[PDB]
């Protein structure tokens, strides 16, 4: 509905897989809600999905949200894969579970509850908020306190 909100999100990881973190800022009429956490072993992709997911789920009513992120991964999937998955039953052409299906589905459910406008940022053109989120993410990744139970260990 109405009620405007601005969300900034970033994800960080030290390896692949390695300790990682996310950072997100929920802003409404000047007020800011900050989010972040570190995980002992995760991926950059998953943190980037986790940042968007946490912020959105923090919303308790239909909102017009402008989602700002530097993630190429999140971008490709919102504009290139999400549609095919939905029509293919969250399965890859050759019928087979997509990577991070747990987070993509949960993020898609998150997006459904609001009218979203994506603001993709490239290189040095992101706002000051996109960098606070990066500091939060990198800080969390250096002091992880949680396990990413949904990550299928690939190594
Ligand atoms: Mn980043």
Features:
155 residues; 4 helices; Nucleotidyltransferase, domain 5; binds manganese (II) ion; 5 strands; monomer; 5-stranded mixed sheet; alpha/beta
Question: Over all CA atoms, what is the radius of gyration?
Answer: 15 Å
The portion of residues forming beta strands comes to 25-35%
Order of helical and strand elements: EEEHEHHEH
Overall helicity: 25-40%
Strand-pairing-aware structural class: alpha/beta
What is the first-to-last residue Cα distance? 44 Å
Which descriptor suits the 3D outline? Answer: globular
What name does CATH use for the topology? Nucleotidyltransferase, domain 5
Structure annotation, total helices: 4
Binding site for Mg(2+) 1: 10, 48, 70
EC number: 3.1.26.4
InterPro entries: RNase_H, RNaseH-like_sf, RNaseH_domain, RNaseH_sf, RNaseHI
Domain RNase H type-1: 1-142
Explain the layout of strands and helices.
Layout: E1 4-13, E2 18-28, E3 31-42, H1 44-56, E4 64-69, H2 72-87, H3 101-112, E5 115-120, H4 128-142
Parallel strand pairs: 1-4, 4-5
Antiparallel strand pairs: 1-2, 2-3
Bound molecules: manganese (II) ion.
Manganese (II) ion is lined by residues 10, 12, 70, 134.
Keywords: Cytoplasm, Endonuclease, Hydrolase, Magnesium, Metal-binding, Nuclease
GO molecular function: endonuclease activity; magnesium ion binding; nucleic acid binding; RNA-DNA hybrid ribonuclease activity
Catalytic activity: Endonucleolytic cleavage to 5'-phosphomonoester
């Amino acid at each position: 509905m109405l009620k405007q909100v601005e969300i900034f999100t970033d994800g960080s990881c030290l390896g692949n897989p390695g300790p990682g973190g996310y950072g997100a800022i929920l802003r409404y009429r000047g007020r800011e809600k900050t989010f972040s956490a570190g995980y002992t072993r995760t991926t950059n992709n998953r943190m980037e999905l986790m940042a968007a997911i946490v912020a959105l789920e923090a919303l308790k009513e239909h909102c017009e949200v402008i989602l700002s992120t530097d993630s190429q991964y999140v971008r490709q999937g919102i504009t290139q894969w999400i549609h095919n998955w939905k029509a293919r039953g969250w399965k890859t052409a050759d019928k087979k579970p997509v990577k991070n299906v747990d987070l993509w589905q949960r993020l898609d459910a998150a997006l459904g509850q609001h009218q979203i406008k994506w603001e993709w940022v490239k290189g040095h053109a992101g706002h000051p908020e996109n960098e606070r989120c990066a500091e939060l993410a990198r800080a969390a990744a250096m002091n992880p306190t949680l396990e990413d139970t949904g990550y299928q260990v690939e190594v």
